[PDB]
Amino acid sequence: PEIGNNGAEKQISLHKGQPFIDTQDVGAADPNTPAVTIEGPSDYVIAIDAGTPVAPEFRDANGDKLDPSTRVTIQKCDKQGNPLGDGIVFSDTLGRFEYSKMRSDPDYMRKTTTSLMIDEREIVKIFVEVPPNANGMDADNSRITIGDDTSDYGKAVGIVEHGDLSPAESKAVRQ
Amino acid sequence: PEIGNNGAEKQISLHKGQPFIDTQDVGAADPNTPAVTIEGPSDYVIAIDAGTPVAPEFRDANGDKLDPSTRVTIQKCDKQGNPLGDGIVFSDTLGRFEYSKMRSDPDYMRKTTTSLMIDEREIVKIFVEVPPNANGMDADNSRITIGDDTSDYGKAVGIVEHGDLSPAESKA
Amino acid sequence: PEIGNNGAEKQISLHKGQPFIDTQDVGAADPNTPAVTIEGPSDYVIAIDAGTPVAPEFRDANGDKLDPSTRVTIQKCDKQGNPLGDGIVFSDTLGRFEYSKMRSDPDYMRKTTTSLMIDEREIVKIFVEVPPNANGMDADNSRITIGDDTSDYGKAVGIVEHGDLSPAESKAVRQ
Amino acid sequence: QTQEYTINHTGGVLGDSYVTTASNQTSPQRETAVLSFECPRKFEEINYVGQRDATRFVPRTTESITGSANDDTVVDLTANIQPVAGEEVIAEQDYPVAVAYNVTQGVEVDVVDADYAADTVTLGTNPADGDEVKVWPIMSDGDVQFRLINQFGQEEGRVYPWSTPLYRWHDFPQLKRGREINLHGSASWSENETLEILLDAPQALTWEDSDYPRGQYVTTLEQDVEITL
Amino acid sequence: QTQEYTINHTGGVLGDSYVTTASNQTSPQRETAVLSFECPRKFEEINYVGQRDATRFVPRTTESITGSANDDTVVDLTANIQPVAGEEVIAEQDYPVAVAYNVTQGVEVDVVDADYAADTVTLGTNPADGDEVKVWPIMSDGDVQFRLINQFGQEEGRVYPWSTPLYRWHDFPQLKRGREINLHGSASWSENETLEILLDAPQALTWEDSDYPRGQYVTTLEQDVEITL
Amino acid sequence: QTQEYTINHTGGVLGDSYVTTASNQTSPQRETAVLSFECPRKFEEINYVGQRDATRFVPRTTESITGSANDDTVVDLTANIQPVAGEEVIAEQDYPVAVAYNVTQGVEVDVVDADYAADTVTLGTNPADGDEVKVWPIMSDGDVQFRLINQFGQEEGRVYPWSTPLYRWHDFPQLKRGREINLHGSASWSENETLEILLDAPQALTWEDSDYPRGQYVTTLEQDVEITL
Amino acid sequence: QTQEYTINHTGGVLGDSYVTTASNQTSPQRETAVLSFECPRKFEEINYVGQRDATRFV
């Protein structure tokens, strides 16, 4: 057998069924909570470029799409669930995706605005603003995906083991 | 408040609901009658480039498309409603547009052939040739659009106020 | 009247309704025969470049597509129906064309691998490998097309009269 | 410093106070002000650029009918009508051209098709006599534009002279880069200064009905902007 | 001086006199002349170039049946058949592969599908016994070509030696740049000289029927040319 | 020396012996091994490269219902559902999202549409009471991956760490170059060494049913590889 | 190293597995494959020469 020594900067993507991610249900008129939480695993470094695709595909408990006036906001945080204004990306509305062809089509493929980085212990949150008198989010059917592996279109999330590279700490301090 | 001094060469498009444009119904086998008339407003200059999109969407009174063997011809005119051989553009057929995706699709987007210009008082007409024993045009449902603002595809109609630039008279 | 003296290297394409081509039905588990035979006409020279499009659109007798595990192989031959290993091109599977958009789309447009040439008396065969317990090929509905005239995309089959050019024999010996 | 956000007809980054909505007027055709956004205390400034910043604006109207014994299955309208980016078919559109709701039977009502030439639309269901109905068809035959206000209801300028028709706005397929809409003009303002989004059209649009199935707020605006923190 | 026009099987820039149409022949397979265009008095010359000038040519045929008591809902044909650029579905095509019209019931007749393998097509309606019918299916298995005439019915040359099949002509999706059809050859002529567009195929095509719904002239040609005023 | 072949879930270049299939497991969510290919005696070695070698993998599941007197015309499901690359319409898809077959009436059953939001699907026909039915809908909510075995059931490595979801796998339109799927990783093995294709998902997929119309083997895999003779 | 053997339509040095027989076809006159011999695992190579190697086929 033979396998190629693939580069440390591995091309990956994020989704629900992973250990360093979590979600929880949401009601209405309810900005403060992360519907979805992400955290940096230990001794790893994640990198999200500016042209990274984004793809929330939330649902209602009865299996429906929500009010497109709903808003989604990805946002970096300092440790301790402490958000920060700078570094925010993807302040979008829940409408205007066409989930059917969303990831499928590079046109519909909504990318981020600016670059981003996740040091080994950091947080990225996904806040949601639903107008009142509306249905709530259901975590069983909701989903997030970011990055585009497995396609000549779109970009992919970079990852690297912190212990391999020597300037990994330099890039971590650089943020 | 603050607004940027946008360039004089403004990027625009033409359609039915404007003052310097007009239309009138058409029957059958009536080439001389212009279905649509355009005129240059006062102290303005319009410019239509060669790669300008074109988009007639004529209809029948009952709400149908007409015989695609029908012909459409955009044509510049001297003053007094007088046509000209040179300067004409877009001698096309009424078929082969697929109005559904026409403006939508850069493929279906049919462009002009050559450049064009409209001095302050000039005319551009849109003649139509329908074969006989066919239905007539209905102005309530018909429409023209030319130029492509608001899209990275296509081109737009240039406009400028004559009273701003000094060599506008030389360009005219 | 006036006609332009078009160059001798004429840009052409091949299909069923021609004299120097032929076909015949095929059963199952049946490699050896050419479902379609091609031959060089007299005192002509055909040239097929490496980036030449290819387009088999075989069918079943009932008017259906066959098992996509089926295989198609274009192959040059010496005279006498004598195949040769070198010079083979287009060893493809019958699936993964999407016949609807196949020629239509440059994406779906499957090209050859390497160049090719046909001297005045030579043969090119199209062998087909169908797995057993499957339906057979029907020549009435089957078809081959190669080359792309009439499109800015794709390439076209070159042809030349052997009697016109003096180094036509040189190129024929060159193969 | 600088970011690229979206702003909506409600809340968002602002907080539902320094937005305000309003309907148009029907009998006097006038350049009403249907929406306006006031730069809050906390920001430094806001920018706005054409051919850089995308946009979306889905308006509608409201009308009503009266149930009758006769099997209507069709209603006329007071508004010019066309499909969403053009098509005879329903459920292929980027969104429904029209929605209908029965007060008695608190359920949605599908749509089959329409003529799209005269002010006409089909209903798939068979309304009963006396039943109350509401419908939120597409809107047409209008103009939209921008202007700035310096804290006082006192105009200083205009983003772009020439209005764009909402008709055309519906005609283009939205939310496609390359085909995305991008107006012209390069505006910028600061604290407590307002951008007003203005409407000139006959038919009475809506913002809220409290009995509309596909979301609470019927219409919507979603514009891209650049902000200095 | 030079322009780029379209020319059609009727009138256009010419005036319906210096066009002439004609049908083909069936029993003797022969390279008939289905269309021809004579350069009028007023022009100076006409040019024609391949890989520069686009084209369209939608032909059809005609056939008839006889109503019967049995619920036919399907008819065989005498012409090879395929979909318009390929698809099993109707109303997705660039145009209908086939049209049918009932003489008695002066109405269109929809189409569901067909086998597209044998000479077959389905009808969605249920024709009555004794009712007369007409159908204008797609045409297949033919060749098209060009030639020039020097005022006398006296050939001097041929635009392009090798014929292109109309079969393939229908197969490509038309009216798409990049995928648009562009024949070969570079012709040019002058006053009263004729270009003949010729057909070699078995099935009897048509130009006029006076009872065809989708326009008066059934078939059509639309070719790009260059003209010197 | 080197070639570029396709390999399938049955036979092919191997010979139906050194393939083996298997279903997954439902109650314990576990990284089962649904397929595996063992390099035969005759080859020298096999290679496998990402961003070089294309791929296809159409899985499904199976479910059943019970006929009733009430006109069902709709069935719920136990699997998340979406269209094939997205669309509300049937027969436009690259393939049917779902297939249904009636045991009594040994015929296919068409599909009209579905909600595609909850676990729902419509049936066009009207099943009778007591009639047995089978359905093979699309599958969703899973992960797929690769691993190598050195003749002993004894792993040495993993092609690519991170799993790709079959959900996304269905979402992309397959069989389009540029849009074709190409995983990552560069593997290679030799005689009697095995590549296992593994599945992690709840719903019970299938390989064979013996009563499925659209071919014998329901699901399929078709992968590109490079071989040294 | 080198030897000169005979090989038959059954078994012989091969072992009845890497032989295979087959009939021809009648209605389509076609160049069928009636017999075939696959070089087994154990050998190094096989040669075949004309005007050197005799033959029989009844």
Cα separation, B22 vs B24, in Å, equals: 7
- β-bridge mates for residue B127, sequence order: B34, B73
Stated resolution in angstroms: 3.8
Cα separation, D105 vs F83, in Å, equals: 31
- Contact between A157 and A79 (Cβ < 8 Å): no
Residues 6+ apart with CB under 8 A from C160: C8, C9, C10, C44, C45, C47, C168
Q: Among A120, A122, A125, A127, which residue's Cα sits nearest to residue A37?
A: A125
For chain E, the 3-state helix, strand and coil shares in percent, each to the nearest 5, are 5, 35, 60
Subunit contact D156:B99, Cβ cutoff 8 A: no
Query: What residues in B contact D117, CB-CB < 8 Å?
Result: 59, 62-63, 141
D partners (3+ CB pairs within 8 A) are: A, B, F
- β-bridge mates for residue A55, sequence order: A145
Query: What residues in D contact B158, CB-CB < 8 Å?
Result: none
For residue B33, how far is the Cα from the chain centroid? 16
Pairing of strands E186-189, C2-3: antiparallel
Cα separation, C139 vs C25, in Å, equals: 5
Q: Among E223, E225, E15, E20, which residue's Cα sits nearest to residue B29?
A: E15
Residue type, F159: V
Q: Structure tokens of E29?
A: 């397979």
Three-state SS across chain B? CEECCCCCCEEECECCCCCCEEECCECCCCCCCEEEEEECCCCEEEEECCCCEEEECCCECCCCCCCCCCEEEEEEEECCCEECCCCCEEEEECCCCCCCCCCCCCCCCEECCCCEEECCCCEEEEEEECCCCCCCECCCCCCEEECCCCCCCCCCEEEEECCCCCCHHHHC
Q: Which among D9, D11, D178 is the nearest to A129, CB-wise?
A: D11
Q: How far is F92 from chain A (nearest CA, A)?
A: 14
**Residues in chain C, how many?**
175
Q: Which among D13, D56, D216 is the nearest to A131, CB-wise?
A: D216
Q: Structure tokens of E171?
A: 């197969």
Q: Among F150, F91, F102, F155, which residue's Cα sits nearest to residue F127?
A: F102
Which of A59, A65, A105, A150 should be substituted to probe chain F, the one whose Cβ sees the most F Cβ atoms within 10 Å? A150
Cα separation, E34 vs E146, in Å, equals: 11
Q: Among D196, D205, D121, which residue's Cα sits nearest to residue D166?
A: D205
- The b/e string for E109-127 (b: 16+ C-beta within 10 A; e otherwise) is bebeebebbebebbbebeb
- Contact between E3 and E226 (Cβ < 8 Å): yes
Subunit contact D193:B1, Cβ cutoff 8 A: yes
Q: Which among F8, F94, F179 is the nearest to C69, CB-wise?
A: F8
Subunit contact E171:C152, Cβ cutoff 8 A: no
Interface check E188 vs C, CB under 8 A: yes
Subunit contact B152:D115, Cβ cutoff 8 A: no
Q: How far is G51 from chain C (nearest CA, A)?
A: 22
Which of G24, G29, G30, G36 should be substituted to probe chain C, the one whose Cβ sees the most C Cβ atoms within 10 Å? G30
Three-state SS across G9-50? CCCCCCCCCCEEECCCCCCCCCCCCCEEECCCCCCCCCCCCC
A partners (3+ CB pairs within 8 A) are: D, F
In eight-state DSSP terms, residue A168 is: H
Could you give the angle at the alpha carbon of A94 between the alpha carbons of A90 and A100, nearest 5°? 105
Cα separation, E84 vs E95, in Å, equals: 7
Q: How far is C108 from chain F (nearest CA, A)?
A: 6
Query: What residues in D contact F89, CB-CB < 8 Å?
Result: 92
Which residues does B contribute to its contact with E (CB < 8 Å)? 67-69, 71, 85, 88, 91-93, 95-96, 98, 107-108, 113-114, 129, 131-134
Three-state SS across chain D? CEEEEEEECCCCCCCCCCEEECCCCCCCCCCEEEEEEECCCCCCCEEEECCCCCEEEECEECEEEECCCCCCCEEECCCCCCCCCCCCCCCCCCCCCCCEEECCCCCEECCCCCCCCCCEEECCCCCCCCCEEEECCECCCCEEEEEEECCCCCEEECCCCCCEEHHHHHHCCCCCCCCCCCCCCEEEECCCCEEEEEEECCCCECCECCCCCCCCECCEEEEEEEEEC
**DSSP calls for chain F:** -EEEEEEESSSTTT-SSSEEE----SSS---EEEEEEE--SS-S-EEEETTTS-EEEE-BB-EEEE--SS---EEE-SS----SSS-S-SSSSSS-S--EEESSS-SEE------SSSSEEE-SS-PPTT-EEEE--B--S-EEEEEEE-SSS-EEE-S-SSPEEHHHHHHS--S-TTTS-----EEEE-TT-EEEEEEE-SS-B-SB-S--SS-SBSSEEEEEEEEE-
Sheet containing strand C10-12, edge to edge, reads C10-12, C157-161, C44-48, C116-118
- Residue A118 sits at φ, ψ, to 5 deg, of -130, 110
Residue type, E2: T
Cα separation, E37 vs G52, in Å, equals: 75
- Give the ranges where chain E is alpha helix by DSSP (H): 166-171
Q: Among D209, D224, D205, D186, which residue's Cα sits nearest to residue D26?
A: D205
Subunit contact B103:D171, Cβ cutoff 8 A: yes
Subunit contact E160:C149, Cβ cutoff 8 A: no
For F:55-74, CB contacts with A below 8 A are none
Domain ranges of chain C: 1-175
Pairing of strands C71-78, C123-129: antiparallel
Q: Among E84, E79, E112, which residue's Cα sits nearest to residue E97?
A: E84
Q: Among B23, B20, B19, which residue's Cα sits nearest to residue B35?
A: B23
List Cα–Cα distances, A24 to A21, F121, G26, in angstroms.
11, 28, 72
- Contact between D58 and D95 (Cβ < 8 Å): yes
* Burial of residue F153 (number of CB atoms within 10 Å: 0-12, 13-18, 19+): exposed
Touch of C by F (3+ CB pairs closer than 8 Å): yes
Residues 6+ apart with CB under 8 A from G17: none
Residue found by looking up tokens 């649509």 in the block: B36
Query: What residues in B contact E11, CB-CB < 8 Å?
Result: 71, 129, 131
Q: Structure tokens of C82?
A: 């004598």
Cα separation, E183 vs E141, in Å, equals: 18
Query: What residues in F contact E92, CB-CB < 8 Å?
Result: 92
CA dihedral A45, A50, A51, A56 (to 10 degrees): 80
Q: How far is F196 from chain A (nearest CA, A)?
A: 14
Distance in Å from the first CA to the final CA of chain F: 6
Q: Is E170 helix (H, G, I), strand (E, B) or coil?
A: helix
Subunit contact A1:F190, Cβ cutoff 8 A: yes
Q: How far is D213 from chain F (nearest CA, A)?
A: 16
Query: What residues in E contact B93, CB-CB < 8 Å?
Result: 6, 8, 222
Q: Is E169 helix (H, G, I), strand (E, B) or coil?
A: helix
* Burial of residue C120 (number of CB atoms within 10 Å: 0-12, 13-18, 19+): middle
Subunit contact B131:E177, Cβ cutoff 8 A: no
Residue found by looking up tokens 């939120």 in the block: D136
Which of C26, C33, C82, C129 should be substituted to probe chain G, the one whose Cβ sees the most G Cβ atoms within 10 Å? C33
E146 HSE (CA, 13 A, CB side): 19
- Contact between G21 and G29 (Cβ < 8 Å): no
Q: Which among B63, B145, B150 is the nearest to D115, CB-wise?
A: B63
Subunit contact B63:D156, Cβ cutoff 8 A: no
Q: Is E85 helix (H, G, I), strand (E, B) or coil?
A: coil
